[PDB]
Structures are given as structure tokens and as C-alpha cells.
Amino acid sequence: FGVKTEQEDVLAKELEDVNKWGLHVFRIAELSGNRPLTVIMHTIFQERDLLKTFKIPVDTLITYLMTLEDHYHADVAYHNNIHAADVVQSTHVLLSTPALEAVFTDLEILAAIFASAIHDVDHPGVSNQFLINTNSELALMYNDSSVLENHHLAVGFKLLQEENCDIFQNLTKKQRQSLRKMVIDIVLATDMSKHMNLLADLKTMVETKKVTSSGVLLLDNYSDRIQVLQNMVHCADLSNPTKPLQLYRQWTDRIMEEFFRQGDRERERGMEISPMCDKHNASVEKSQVGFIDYIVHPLWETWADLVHPDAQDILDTLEDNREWYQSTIP
Numbered sequence: 001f002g003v004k005t006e007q008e009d010v011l012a013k014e015l016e017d018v019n020k021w022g023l024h025v026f027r028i029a030e031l032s033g034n035r036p037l038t039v040i041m042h043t044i045f046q047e048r049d050l051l052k053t054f055k056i057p058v059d060t061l062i063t064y065l066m067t068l069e070d071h072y073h074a075d076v077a078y079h080n081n082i083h084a085a086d087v088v089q090s091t092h093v094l095l096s097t098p099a100l101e102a103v104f105t106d107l108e109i110l111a112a113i114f115a116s117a118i119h120d121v122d123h124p125g126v127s128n129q130f131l132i133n134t135n136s137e138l139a140l141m142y143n144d145s146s147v148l149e150n151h152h153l154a155v156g157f158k159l160l161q162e163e164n165c166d167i168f169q170n171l172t173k174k175q176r177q178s179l180r181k182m183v184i185d186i187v188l189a190t191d192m193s194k195h196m197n198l199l200a201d202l203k204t205m206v207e208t209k210k211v212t213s214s215g216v217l218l219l220d221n222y223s224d225r226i227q228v229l230q231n232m233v234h235c236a237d238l239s240n241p242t243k244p245l246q247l248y249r250q251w252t253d254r255i256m257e258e259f260f261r262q263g264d265r266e267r268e269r270g271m272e273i274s275p276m277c278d279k280h281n282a283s284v285e286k287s288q289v290g291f292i293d294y295i296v297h298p299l300w301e302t303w304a305d306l307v308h309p310d311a312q313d314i315l316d317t318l319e320d321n322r323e324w325y326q327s328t329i330p
């Protein structure tokens, strides 16, 4: 039969929501046999006609995607393939915002989406500080500097060398060099130690914002173009509290499981327990409200100004969720 199975039909119907904020990504993960990253990336590549544009052989794309997904750890609660798929899809929605229509080139679009897909690959489920404090091999390889983020990049690129995995094999050297630099700049910007400087620069850009005729953002140098892409993927990475609450709470459960596990390791070892990682002295709800107030809302408020009024519903959902978590603090 050259026709989908019923489970593949149910999956294809869920994937009709790929252009929407609030895609049922956990359901996609179940329906695809734990291939949310592969199926969501493929759908996006097809939808944006990236295979044709970059002459990517379909089998090579699928092989690379499965390989990349395979390098996300299934035994990690939050920083796994479902998170990668979610960041990919959220970036895909943000790239389609009316205020950015026709701003970015196909190569820049490719860069933002590919960066999103690789941005947490091979994450061990512990923080940079934990890796540094434990004298881990990763921290030694990267000289304690954006350890995880450098690692995600190195793995994401190295996997292109596996059998029939080089999705960029038909790009010119000039295209490849440009793509690579942008990908590196985007993934390194996902290190939360960079958040305050990224946000400061995004605020400066909003303050000196120029729009073209027809009211789309004018970005006429690399610094500004990459700043916007960096902040975009960073928004996607920090998008959990902006999603419908049924999704958000699953993300909260997962990050807390991950953090608590790290805290258990820190406690076993006699180390100081990192913020939000002590399961005996946690308030999950207060932690979410703090995460929103201090990190997520300042970023998304500034993004919303940049693309005004495109992100109003996202900001409203964020504010509703914040009130919900506040109302459950004992």
C-alpha cells in the first residue's frame, strides 16, 4: 500500500497546526514514535521549500535529522528531542511574523531553523556550572566558556560527516561559510549568561527602530540582522510560559525534574545546590513567577515592541499564565 498508515494519517493531521503557536508537540512526539524533531523539521523544510532551494537530497535530510534526533538524550527530562522540536517550530512561527515579512534571506531562514534544531543536542541534563564545578571533560574541552553551547554546535556540525548526512553538500563554499557563522552566532546566544546583553541590544534596536514602506523592519547590516535572529531563537528557547497552559505545565514538570535531579547530584556530592534545584526547598510556582517576571516577560515585552502588534496574543497568554501560577502560590 503506497498510502499512509492510520497512525501516520493522525500525525499528518496534527502537523497541519505546524504554523500555529501551541502545536500539540507532545502528541506529535507520541504519534511519530518519538520522532518529533525529524517530522517537524521535514514538514518545515518542505513548507518553506528549502530542499529545492538548497538542493538538499531528501534521503540525506531524513538521515541527518534522524541522526541529530538520536543524539538528543531520551533519559533527560527537558533537554531532549521534544524540546528541540518545540524550539524549531516556535522559531518557524516567529520567522513568519507579519513585521518580518520578506526581511530575511533563505540562507538566514535556514540558519535560524538549523540552529534551533541543533541548539541543545547531546545535552547531559546538567548546567554549565555543574560541569565546570565537577571538572567534567566537557568543561575542560571548552575552557569553562559556554561549555554546553559550544558542545551542541560541535556535535550538530560533526554529525554532518556521518554516512549520507551532509545536508549542505550542494551549497557553495560562500553559502556554507555564511550559514556556519550565523548558526554559531545564534547557538552561542542561547547561553543564559548572554541574556542581559542580548536584551539590552534588543531594547536599543526597538528605541531606534526603522520600518520600510509597508511597515516591515529595516535591518541593513549583519550586526542588526544577526541580533534579531539571535533574539528570535532565544525567544523560542524561552517560549514555554507563552504557550497554552496545558503545554506550559508539561514543560514546567520537565524542567523541574531535570533541575531536581541535578540538585540531588549536588547534594550527594556536598556541593551548593543550584537555584531551583533543591526538591526539599522548592516552590515550583514561585520559581515560575520569578522566571516570568525577571526573564521571560522582559524579553517578550521587548520582542512584542519590535514586531508590534504581532505578538500581542503571545504576550497576553504569558500574562494570563503568570497570574495562574501566582494564584497557586500557598
Ligand SMILES: COc1ccc(C2=NN(C3CCN(C(=O)CN4C(=O)CC(C)(C)CC4=O)CC3)C(=O)[C@@H]3CC=CC[C@H]23)cc1OC
Pocket (backbone or CB within 6 Å): 190, 192, 237, 238, 240, 241, 251, 252, 255, 275, 276, 286, 287, 288, 290, 291, 292, 294, 295
Ligand atoms: C519552564 O520553565 C523554565 C524553563 C527553562 C528554564 C531555564 N533555566 N535556565 C536558567 C534561567 C535563569 N535562571 C534563573 O533562575 C533566573 N531567575 C528565575 O528564573 C527565578 C528566580 C530564581 C526566582 C530569579 C531569577 O533570576 C537560572 C536557570 C537555563 O539556563 C535553561 C537553559 C536555557 C534557557 C532557559 C532554561 C527555567 C524555567 O523555569 C525556572
Ligand SMILES: [Mg+2]
Pocket (backbone or CB within 6 Å): 119, 120, 148, 190, 191
Ligand atoms: Mg541550551
Ligand SMILES: [Zn+2]
Pocket (backbone or CB within 6 Å): 083, 087, 119, 120, 237
Ligand atoms: Zn534550549
